[PDB]
Amino acid sequence: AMCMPCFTTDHNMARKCDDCCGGKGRGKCYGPQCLCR
Known about the structure:
Blueprint: E1 4-5, H1 13-21, E2 27-30, E3 33-36
Antiparallel strand pairs: 1-3, 2-3
């Protein structure tokens, strides 16, 4: 399912997840998975 992981130890996890999902507000970190909205 995931575009990429979300690791809480990576304080930039939300910006990375957005990058994976195509830009601002497009990705959500839900537990350990970045999911494209």
